[PDB]
C-alpha cells in the first residue's frame with residue numbers, strides 16, 4: 001500500500017502509535033498494539049500464500065501455448081520462491097507473537113536494549129537493536145567467507 005508509513009501499518013487497520021509523555025516502553029496498551037499489527041500482517045501473508053498456491057494449481061491445470069511455456073515456467077518459479085519466503089516470514093511473526101504472549105517483546109536479543117517503537121512499527125519482527133543486528137551481519141560475512 002502506497003503509504004509514507006509502511007503499508008504494514010496500512011495492512012493492519014492501525015495508525016502510528018501516539019506515545020504519551022510518561023508511558024513506560026512496552027506496556028499493555030503498547031504490546032496490544034504491536035500484537036494486533038503482527039497478527040494482521042501474518043493473516044495477510046497467509047492469504048497471499050493461499051492465493052499463490054491456488055494460482056500455481058490453476059497454472060498446472062491450464063496448458064500454455066508453446067510460445068508462453070518458458071514464460072509460465074519463469075513466473076512459476078518466482079511464485080514458488082516468493083511463496084516460500086512468505087512462509088518464513090509467517091513463522092517469524094508467529095515467533096514474535098509468542099514473545100508478546102510471553103511479555104518479552106520489544107528488546108534487543110543480544111544486548112538488553114529496547115528496540116525503537118517506531119523501529120518496531122517498521123519491522124515488528126525485529127530481534128536486534130541496529131548495532132547488534134549489524135554486527136551480526138558483519139560477523140556473518142567474515143565467519144562465512
Ligand SMILES: [Zn+2]
Pocket residue numbers: 108109110111112113128129130131132133
Ligand atoms: Zn543490541
